[PDB]
Symmetry: C2
Subunit: 334 residues, 2 copies
């Protein structure tokens, strides 16, 4: 596998690619003007040290911010409407906070908390303008708990972990399916219209498990409460031992990669280093020669379809996080 | 002056200089192994995108962390013992937190809060092992409030600002001296053993005013409480109009420059941009050809006296912060 330094070199190439093509208003080079194209941009560009570019994204985001602290438009992808609406808001909060844009992060995080279910601790899947039944999902809840950790709302993070532990315990058929949604009372939803990961098939969706593993490990680091470490390690064993190989190969595997890298630094267990090395090396290998990532395109393009742009910023972030946790883990343990 | 891109270029050269010479345990290349040589390193290296080097400083800092969350040793400079002990801890808390080292930042911040005076909101000048009279100073209080902002302990930040307001209002002779310290009841200390800036002389110590200006401006951004913007504005007016021109020339002027850059982004007042540009250009002009900053050193050296190492990391941070607030200020206002 490639070294932590090589993972970082790859992240820097993509960050440079984004910055070279950033628009004057600060938007990143997407073929459609949608918030799901650049919600990871502030955090990703800041970790690459492109802080003026990251601040320009913050300027762009601030120009879209509504009085309630939400960015309800522009949104087109329905996963950002009724599956995990807050997935955009969570990265926006973290990126704003780490940049010191404390007014933006306060407003964003306060809106996120209006979508918290006080009884289960989960976060609602569908946004305010989107009809739904109050279901909460593992991804909305996980990213919201992580944003709460960065903004110091540790009680909210703990309550999100309560939701996740209940989702985990209540699974009716864990060998074959992970049902990632609970209803407004906290019962696991097995409806056809609720997100369900096919555990023993190569059909993606793994970040509904991997993002919880990352968040729970971060929450353990913040509190040293072993209950959170226990659930994170149980989720990682599940993805490693019980899920299809696709869990570490699909484009959504980066979340588990970060979780394994962090678990490695915190516990020193060698399997966690291997998982994170393997995932980081895989993302590095898929990078296009010109510096971005794309499902289908390979040329010297000037912009990307929103999903590739998001994936490109996302891998800047995961390669950086995997890199620094593996490098520190080697210093601490080896 | 110099463009925001030019300031960032100087910061990046200095960060590269540091990282090339960083030691295997994570320590920065100081001729003496003291915490005051590298307390700004986590945050500075993170802003430069050098996240593996920043995390390596975190590993080093973590190895020194005591059970109470303090790093009482190694310390040698008196200013880090009984003038502003917590000045190290404050940057360490911010750098740990933005790196996601949430256990480190929680423990560091919680120790910082045990040195808060609950009656005045000030932070004690002398560490637990250092005999003293409970006096509290503007720098300890300012950096501790800023660390509270990054960690989401906003009530602690607001209480720090209350202290700074009492210190400002209580000045007995502000046209001639800025007494930066108060006793444990919050009365301004005028004894000869208490830090006093000779504001009509070119004799340094300006950061006892400039760091408060920066913190209060960030606290305004977090809360939108104009009382904090008002006090920041009065301190910047004071430094610009009542203080010797050395206030924007001395090595400690970077704090004021950052406050001015931030105030420019928030208010658009052109005088703030001029102050920030003037200070950033001055720092960029003083940089060595190799990347470090030093009062006396001019060779291609492998290490530095702790004060020069601290100053080099410090200018990486301030040039980055000035540059991105000036670049976004231009986008918003120009
Ligand atoms: Mg570069
Ligand atoms: Mg099994
Ligand atoms: Mg080209």
């Amino acid at each position: 596998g490639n070294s932590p330094h090589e993972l970082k070199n790859a992240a820097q190439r993509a960050a440079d690619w984004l910055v070279e093509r950033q628009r004057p208003n600060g938007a990143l080079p997407s073929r459609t003007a949608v918030i799901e194209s650049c919600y990871k941009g502030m955090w990703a560009l800041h970790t690459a040290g492109h802080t003026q570019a990251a601040s320009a994204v913050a300027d762009y985001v601030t120009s879209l911010l509504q009085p309630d602290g939400d960015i309800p438009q522009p949104r087109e992808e329905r996963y950002f409407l009724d599956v995990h609406y807050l997935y955009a808001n969570g990265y926006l909060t973290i990126g704003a906070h780490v940049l010191g844009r404390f007014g933006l992060s306060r407003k964003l995080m306060s809106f996120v908390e209006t979508m918290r279910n006080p009884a289960t601790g989960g976060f609602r899947s569908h946004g305010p303008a989107i009809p739904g039944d109050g279901r909460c999902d593992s991804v909305s809840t996980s990213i919201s708990g992580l944003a709460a950790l960065y903004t110091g709302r540790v009680d909210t993070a703990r309550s999100a972990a309560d939701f996740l532990g209940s989702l985990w315990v209540g699974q009716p058929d864990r060998k074959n399916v992970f049902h990632a949604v609970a209803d407004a009372s906290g019962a696991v939803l097995t409806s056809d219209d609720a997100v369900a990961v096919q555990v023993r098939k190569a059909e993606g969706d793994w970040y509904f498990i991997g993002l919880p593993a990352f968040f729970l490990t971060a929450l353990y680091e913040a509190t040293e409460d072993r209950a959170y470490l226990d659930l994170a390690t149980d989720l990682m064993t599940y993805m490693d031992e019980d899920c299809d190989e696709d869990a570490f190969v699909d484009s959504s595997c980066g979340k588990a990669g970060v979780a394994a890298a962090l678990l490695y630094r915190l516990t020193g267990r060698p399997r966690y280093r291997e998982i994170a090395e393997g995932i980081g090396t895989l993302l590095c290998e898929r990078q296009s020669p010109y510096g971005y990532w794309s499902e289908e395109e390979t040329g010297d393009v000037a912009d990307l379809f929103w999903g590739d742009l998001d994936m490109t910023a996302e891998y800047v972030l995961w390669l950086d996080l995997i890199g620094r946790n593996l490098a520190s883990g080697e210093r601490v343990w080896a």
